[PDB]
A paper describes a structure:
Because of the lower resolution of the Fo region, focused refinement with Fo was conducted by masking the Fo region. The refined structure achieved resolutions of 3.5–6.6 Å, confirming that the peripheral stalk always accompanies Fo a-subunits. In the triple-stalk FoF1, all three a-subunits interacted with the c-ring. Each a-subunit interacted with three neighboring c-subunits, forming an a1c3 unit. Therefore, a total of nine c-subunits interacted with the a-subunits, leaving the remaining c-subunit at the open position (gap) between two a-subunits. As a result, the three a-subunits were not positioned exactly 120° apart from each other. The spatial intervals between the a-subunits are not perfectly symmetric because of the symmetry mismatch between the ring structures of F1 and Fo, that is, threefold versus tenfold. Thus, at the current resolution, the overall structures of the three a-subunits in the triple-stalk FoF1 were essentially identical to each other and closely resembled that of the wild-type Bacillus PS3 FoF1. This suggests that all a-subunits are functional, which is consistent with the aforementioned biochemical analyses showing the enhanced H+/ATP ratio. The structure of the triple-stalk FoF1 clearly showed that the c10 ring can accommodate up to three a-subunits, but not more than four due to spatial constraints.
Numbering used by the authors:
A (entry chain D): 10 to 57, 65 to 255
B (entry chain B): 15 to 66, 73 to 95, 114 to 131, 154 to 191, 198 to 232
C (entry chain A): 15 to 66, 74 to 95, 113 to 131, 154 to 191, 198 to 232
D (entry chain C): 15 to 66, 73 to 95, 112 to 131, 154 to 191, 199 to 232
E (entry chain M), F (entry chain L), G (entry chain U), H (entry chain T), I (entry chain N), J (entry chain S), ...: 2 to 72
O (entry chain K): 7 to 63
P (entry chain F): 9 to 70
Q (entry chain J), T (entry chain H): 7 to 70
The structure:
Amino acid sequence: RINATKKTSQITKAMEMVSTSKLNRAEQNAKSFVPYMEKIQEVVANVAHPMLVSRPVKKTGYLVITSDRGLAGAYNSNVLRLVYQTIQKRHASPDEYAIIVIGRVGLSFFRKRNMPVILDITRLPDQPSFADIKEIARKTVGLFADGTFDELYMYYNHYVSAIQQEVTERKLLPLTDLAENKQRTVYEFEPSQEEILDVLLPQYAESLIYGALLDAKASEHAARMTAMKNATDNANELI
Amino acid sequence: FNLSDMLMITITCLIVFIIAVAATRSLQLRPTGMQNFMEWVFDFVRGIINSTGRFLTLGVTLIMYVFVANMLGLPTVTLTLAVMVVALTHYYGLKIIEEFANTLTLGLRLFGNIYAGEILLGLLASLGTHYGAAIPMMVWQAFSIFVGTIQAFIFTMLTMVYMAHK
Amino acid sequence: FNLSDMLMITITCLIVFIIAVAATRSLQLRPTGMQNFMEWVFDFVRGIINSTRFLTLGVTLIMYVFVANMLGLPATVTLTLAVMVVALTHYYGLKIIEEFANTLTLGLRLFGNIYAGEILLGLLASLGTHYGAAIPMMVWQAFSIFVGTIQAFIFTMLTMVYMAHK
Amino acid sequence: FNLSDMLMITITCLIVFIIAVAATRSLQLRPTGMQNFMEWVFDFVRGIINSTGRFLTLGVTLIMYVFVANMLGLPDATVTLTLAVMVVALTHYYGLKIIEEFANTLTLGLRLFGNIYAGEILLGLLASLGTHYAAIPMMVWQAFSIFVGTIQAFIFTMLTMVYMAHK
Amino acid sequence: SLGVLAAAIAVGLGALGAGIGNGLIVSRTIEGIARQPELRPVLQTTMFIGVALVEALPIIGVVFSFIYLGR
Amino acid sequence: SLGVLAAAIAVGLGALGAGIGNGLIVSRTIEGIARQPELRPVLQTTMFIGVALVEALPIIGVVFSFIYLGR
Amino acid sequence: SLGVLAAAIAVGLGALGAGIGNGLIVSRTIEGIARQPELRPVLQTTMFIGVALVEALPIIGVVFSFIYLGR
Amino acid sequence: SLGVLAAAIAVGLGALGAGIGNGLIVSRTIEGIARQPELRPVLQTTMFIGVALVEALPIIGVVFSFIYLGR
Amino acid sequence: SLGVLAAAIAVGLGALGAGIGNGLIVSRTIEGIARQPELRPVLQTTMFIGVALVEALPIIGVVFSFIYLGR
Amino acid sequence: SLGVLAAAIAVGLGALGAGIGNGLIVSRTIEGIARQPELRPVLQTTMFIGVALVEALPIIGVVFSFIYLGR
Amino acid sequence: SLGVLAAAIAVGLGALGAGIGNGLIVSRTIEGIARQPELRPVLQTTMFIGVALVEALPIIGVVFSFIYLGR
Amino acid sequence: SLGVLAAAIAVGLGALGAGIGNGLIVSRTIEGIARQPELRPVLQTTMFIGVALVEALPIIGVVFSFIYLGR
Amino acid sequence: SLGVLAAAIAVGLGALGAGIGNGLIVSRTIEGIARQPELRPVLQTTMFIGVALVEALPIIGVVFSFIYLGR
Amino acid sequence: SLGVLAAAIAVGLGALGAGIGNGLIVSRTIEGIARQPELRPVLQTTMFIGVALVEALPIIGVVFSFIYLGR
Amino acid sequence: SGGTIIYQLLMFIILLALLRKFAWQPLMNIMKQREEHIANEIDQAEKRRQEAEKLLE
Amino acid sequence: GTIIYQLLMFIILLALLRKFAWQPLMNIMKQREEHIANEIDQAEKRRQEAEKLLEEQRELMK
Amino acid sequence: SGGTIIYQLLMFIILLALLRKFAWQPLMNIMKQREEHIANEIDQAEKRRQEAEKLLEEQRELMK
Amino acid sequence: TIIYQLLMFIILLALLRKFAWQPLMNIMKQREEHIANEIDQAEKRRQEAEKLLE
Amino acid sequence: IIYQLLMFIILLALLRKFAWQPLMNIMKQREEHIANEIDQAEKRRQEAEKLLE
Amino acid sequence: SGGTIIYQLLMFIILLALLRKFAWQPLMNIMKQREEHIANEIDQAEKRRQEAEKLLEEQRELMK
Amino acid sequence: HVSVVTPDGPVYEDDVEMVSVKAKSGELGILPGHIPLVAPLEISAARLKIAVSGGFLEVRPDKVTILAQAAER
C-alpha cells in the first residue's frame, strides 16, 4: 500500500512537471504568433460579397476542441456539456445539429450519442504546426463558401490563469463584428477590390481558426498540470 | 392597289400555311425530324417569351412569316405590319407618340435592311450578267439571309419588350 | 446716358433697399420667417467665404444680382460691375493682361446668359401672341431663373476666389 | 539605267567592304576598339534574332547595308523596291493572304524610302533657303534624321525577321 | 445636281457612326466574355440585340440617301 | 437645289450622333451583366429607358431635314 | 438662298452634340446600379436632372435655326 | 449676306461643346455619388458650379453669332 | 462631275469607320488574351464574328460609291 | 462678308476646345473630391487655376477673330 | 480636276483610320505586355493579324483613289 | 483674297488643338494631387512645364496665320 | 491649281493621324515602364517598332500628296 | 491663290494633332510620376524623347505647307 | 403611298386565325398532353413508392 | 397684346410654381429654424442645469 | 426576259449546295441532341415508374 | 454712360451698406456674442461647480 | 537586278563570310576561356577528393 | 547647285563635329561598360580556376 | 524594412533599397515612397535587392511587409 501510493505520487508529480514544461514551451509560440494576427487585422480593417453578409439560415456546424488523451478535470467536459445544452436548445432539427470535432474524447462522446460527424481530425502533437490543420481549415471554409451551412461557431477554453480556465465561444460565421482601426488609411487595388476581398476572406478565416486552438492547447496543459498537482498532494497526504 | 405586293403576300401566306401543315401533320410524345425542328423552335420562342404564353402563338406566327418573307427575297407591307403590331400591343393592356415613332423606325429599319440587301444582290447579278462572281454572290446571299434572320429575332424581341412594358 | 438702364438700376436699388429694410425690421435672438431667411443667407455666404471683411460686400452683391436677374422675368452695367469688382479686389491687397481679361469674360458670360434668356423669352412671347404655349413658356422662365441663380452663385464664388488669390 | 544610283550602290558596297575588313583586321581573344563594337553589335543582333544563327549572317549584312545607306545621305526608290522584293522572295523560298503580305512588305520598303526622301527634302529645302540668303537648326535636322534612319533600319530588320519566322 | 454627292455624304456619315457603334459594343462584350466564360450565351444574345439596335438607324439613313439620290 | 444637300448633311450628322450615343450607352451594359447576372431585368429596363431619350434628337432632326428637303 | 442650308445644319451638330452628350450620362447610371442596387432611385433623379442641362444648348440652337430659316 | 451660315456654325459648335462638357460632368458626378452615397449635396452643388463654369464660352459665341447675323 | 468626289468621300468615311471598329475589337481581344491565355481560340473566333459584323456597312458604301461613279 | 464666316469658325473652334478642356477639369475635380473628402480647398484652387490656363487661349482667339472681322 | 482632290481626301481618310487602328492596337499590347512580361511571342504574333485586319480597307481605298485620279 | 479665312481657320485650329491638350494635361495632375498631397510642388512644376511645351505649336501657327493674313 | 490644296489637306490629315497614334503609344508605354522598371529594354524595343509601324502609313500619304501636287 | 489657305489648313491640322499628342503624353507621364516618385529623371527623359518623336511629322508638314505657300 | 394596307392587315388576321385553329391548338394541345403525361407518370411512380413504404411499414 | 400675353404667362407660371415650391422651401426654412432653436435652447438648458447642479452641490457640501 | 434572274437562281442553287455540304452536320447534331434529351427524360420517367411498381410488388410479396 | 453707371452703383452700394449692412452686421455680431457669452457662462459655472465639489 | 544581285551575293558571301570566320576567333576564345576554367576547377575538385581519400 | 551642295556638306561636317563633341563620352562609356563586363566575366572564371587549383594543392599537402 | 511574417514567426527582417515581386495581376517594382496598395501573390518567389506560396502584399511609403505562410529562404 505504502509503496504503491509512493510510486503513484512520484509518477504523477514527474509527469505534472513535464506538463508544466510543455505549458512553458507552448507559451512562447502563443506569444510569438501575434504579429501575423495584428497585420492581417489591420489590413482587413483598412480594406473593409458572399461571405460578408448574413442569409436565411438552414443549418449550422459546431466546431469543438478536445484532447487526444484524457486525464483532465474539466477541459474535455465543460465544452461538451455546454455544446450539448445549446444544441438541444437551439438546433432542434438533426439537419441543423451539424457538428465538427477535433478531439478524440469528443469524437467518442459524439459517436456514442449518435451525432452526424461531417469532418474530423485527431492524433495531433502537443505543439502543432500550420500544415497539420491547414487542410481541415480549408475544407471547412470551402464548405461554408459553397453553402452547406449558414453559421459557424467554435467552443473551447481560453487561458486566463493557471488555475482558472474560462470557457467561451466565438463566431466564425459571416463576418460582422470588425473593429475599425483608428488610423483608417485608404489603399489602392491592383486586381480590383472584388477579387482582393474574395481572396483575402478565406485567409482571414483560416487565420482566425488559429489563435483559439493555441489558447485551447495552453488551457488544456494548464488544467492537466493543476489536476495532477492536486492528485499528487492528495496522494502525499493519503500516504 | 399593288398587284405584285398582293401576290407576294399571298405566296408567303401559302408557304406559311403549308409549312404549318407539314409541322403539325402528326402529333405524339416523340418529336423527330420536322417535328424535332418544330419542338426546338417552340422551345426557343417559349424561352424568349419567359425571359421577356398568350402571345406565344402570335410571336411564333410573326417569326415564321418574317422568316418566309426573308427567304422569298433570295430568288407598305412592313409599315402595315408594324402598325398592326403597335395597335395589338396598345390594345393588349408625348410618350405614346414617341413609342409609335420607335415602332415605325424599327419597321422601317427592317424594311431598309431587306431593301439594301435586295438592291446589292440585284446590282451584283446585273454586273455579272453584263460583264460571273459566283462565290462572292453566294457569300452575299449568305450574310444577307443571316442578317435578315438576326433582324427578325431582334424585331421579335423588341415587340416582346414593348408588350411587356405596356 | 441710357435712361432705361438708369431707371432699371434705380428700381433694382430701391428693391434691394426695401428687401434689406424688411429683413432688418426687427432684431431678436430668435429669427423666424424673413429673419430666418436672412440668417440662412448669412450662414451660407459665411460658409462659402470660409471655404474659399468682405462678407457684407459679397452679400450685397449677391442680393443686387439676384434682384437684377429676377426683374428680367417680367452690357454696360455688367461691364461696369466687373470693372468695379476687379478694381476693389486689386485695391484690397501677357499674364496680367489675361488675368484682367478673365474678369471681363466672367461679366460678359453673365450678361450673355441673361441676354439669351431674355431673347428666347421675347421671341416665344411674340410668336405665341401672333399665332399659346403657356406650359413651355413657364418651363423656359423657370429654367432661365434657375440658370441665373447658378450664374449669380458662380459669380460670387469667382469674386471670392479672385480676392483670396489677390 | 541609273548611272548615279549604280555608282552610289557600288560606293556603299565598297564602304561596307572596308568597314568589315577593318573590323576583322586582327583576331584575338579580347575584342577591343573596333573589335569591341563588332562584338557588341553581333551580340545585339543575336539577341534580337533569339527574341524573334543561320540567318544572323544576312541579317547583319542587311543591317550594315541600310546603315551605310542612311550614312551617305547626310552629305533612291528603285533600289529600295528591289531590296524589298528580294527579301520577300528569300523569305518565301526559305520555307489573298500572300498578296496582302507582299503589299505590306512593299509598304514597309516604301516607308523606309519615304523617310529617306523626307530627310533629303528637308536638306534640300535648307540648302534652297541658304541659297536664297541656320547652322544650329541644320545640325538638329541632320542629327534627328540620322537617328530616325537608324531606328527605321532597326525596325525594318525586326519586321523582316518576324516575317521570316512567320513563314 | 449634287444629289449623288449628298447621298454619298449621308451614306459615309452613317457608315462611320455604325462602325464606331459596333466597335464599342463588340469590344465591350469581348471584354465581358474574357472576364467570365460562364455567361457566354447571354453575352452573345445581348451582343446581337445590341448590334441590331445600333445598326437600325443607319439603315434608315441609307434608305433616305437612296431616295434623295433618286430625287 | 441645295435643299437635298442640306437634308443629307442633317441626316448624316444625326445618324452619326445617334450611333455614337447608342454605342456608348450600351457598352457598359455587357460588363454590368457579366459582373452581376442577377440584375438582368432591371438592366433591360434601363436598356429600353433612356435609349429613346438619346434617339429623340435624331428623330426630330431627320423630320426637320425632310421638311427642309420638301422646302 | 444659303439660309436653308444654314438652318438645316444648325440642328445637325445640335443633334450630334446632344446624342454624343447624354450618351455618357446614362452609361454611368447603370454602373452605379450594377455596383449597388439599393441606390437605384437616387441615381435616377440625378440622371433625369443632368440630361436637361446636357440638351439645354441644342434647344437654343433649334429655335435659332427656325429664325435663320425664316430670314 | 452670307453671315447666316456663320451664325449657324457658331451656335452649332457652341452647343456641341456644351453638350460634351455637360455629359462628362454628369457622368463623373453620378459615378462619385454611386461610389460614396454621402456628401450628395456637396457633389450636386459642385456639379452645378461646374455646369455654370462650362456654359460660359458657348453663350458668348451665341451672342457673337447674333451680332454677326445683325451685321 | 461630282460623282468622283462623292465616291471618294463615301470610301474614305467607310474606311475610317472600319478602321476604328477593327482597332477597338482586336485591341480588346489582345487585352483579354493577355488576361487569360486559355480561351485564346474562342476569343479569336468571337473576334472573327466581330470583324465580320463591323465590316458590313463599308462594303455597301463602296458598292454604292461605284454605282454613283457609274451614274 | 467672308471674314464674318472666318471669325465665326474661329469662335466655334475656340469654344469647343475650351468646353472640352474645362469639362474634363471639373469632372476630374469631382472625382478627386469623391476620393478624398477633406481636400476641397486645394482642389478648388487647382480647379480655378486649371480653367484659367485652359481658357487663356480662347480669349486671345476671340480677340483675333474680332480684329479679322473688323478687317 | 476634282478627281485629284477626291483621291487626296480618300487617301487622307484611309491614313487616318489605319493609323488610329494600329496605334491603339500597339498601345493596348504594350499595356498587356508590361502587365505580363512572359508570353511575349503570342502577343507579338497577334500584332500582325491585327494590323493587317485594320489596314485591309485603306489599301483598297488608295487603289480606288488612284483609279479615280486616273479619270 | 481668302487670306482672312486662312488666318482665322488656322487660329481656330490652333486653339482647338491647344485647349484639349492643356485640359487633359492638368486633369491627371489634380488626380495625383488628390492621390498623394505630399508632392504638390513637383507636380505643379511638371504641370507648368507640360502646358508650356504643349502651347508652342499653336503660337507658331498664330504667327504664321498673321503673316499669311498680311500676305 | 486645286492640287496644292489637295496635297496640303492630305499632308495635314496624315500629320494629325500620326500624332494621335504616336501620342497614344508613347503615353501607354510610359505607364508600362512606370509600373515595373526592370522591363525597360523590352518595352523600349517594342515602343520603337510600334511607332515605326504607326508612322509607316503617313510616309506613304506624304509621298502620294507630293505626287498629286506635282501632277 | 489658294496656296495660302492650303498652308493654313495644313499647319492647323498639324498643330491640332501635335497638341493632342503631347497633351496625352504629359498626362500619362504625370500619372506615372504620381505613381512612383523615385523614377522622376527617367520618366522625364522618356517623355522628352517621346514628344520629339510624335512632333517630328508636324514639322515636316509645316515645311511642306511653307513650300506650297511659296508656290 | 397605296391602299393595300387594309387588305394586308385583313390577310394577316385571317392567316393568324386559320393557322391557330388548324395547327397551333392541336400542336399546343399535344405538347400540353405530353407534359401532363410526364407529370402523371411521375405522380404514379411517387404513389407507388408511397404504397410500397406503407406496405413495408 | 404681346406684353399682356407675357404677363399672363408669368402669372400662370407663378401660380403653378407656388404649389410645387411652397412645401420644399417652407420645410427647409423650418428645419433650419428648428436647428437654430435647438442649439439655443440646448445651450440655455445646459446653463440652467449647470447652475442647478452647482447649487445642489453647494447645499450637499453644506 | 433578261439573264439576271437565271444567274441569280444559279447563284442561289450553288449557295444552297455549299451551305448544305458545309452545315448539314452542325444542325443535324443539335436536333439529334434535343431529341436525345427528350428521349432520355421520357425513358428516365418510364424507368422510375417501372422501378416503383417493381418495388411495390416486391414489398407486397415480402409482407405476404 | 459707363462713368455715370459706375458712380451710381458705387453710391448705391455705399448707401445700402452704411444704412442696413452695418446694422445687419451689428445684429449678427450681437447674436453671435450672445451665444458665445451664454457658452462661456455655462463653462465658467461648470468649472466653478467642479472646483467647489472637489 | 543583275548589279543588285552581284552586290547582295558579295554581301552574303565572301566578305561577310570571312568576317564571320574572324569573329569566331574572338567569340569561341571567350567561351573557351570559361570552359577551360570550369574543366580546371573540376580537375582540382577531383584532386581534392583524391587527397581526402 | 554645286555651291549649295558644298555648303550643305560643310554644314553637315560642322554638325557632325558639334554632335560628336557631346556624344563621344556616352558612346565610349557604353563601350567601356561592355568591355568591363566581358573582362569581369573572364576574370571571375580565371580566379575560380586558380582558387580551385590552390585548394586542391592544399588538400594534397594536408593528405601527405 | 522588407520584413516578411508567417504564422509560425518571422523569417527575414532586413532593410533594402529595391524590391521585386511577381503578383497575380502582374509583376510589380516597389520603390520607397510608393502609394499604399494591396495585391495577392500566386505561388511566386519574391526577390529583394525567397518563396511565398500564397499570401498578401501590403506597401507603405515607410516600409513594406509581405505576410504569408510557408515562406522559406
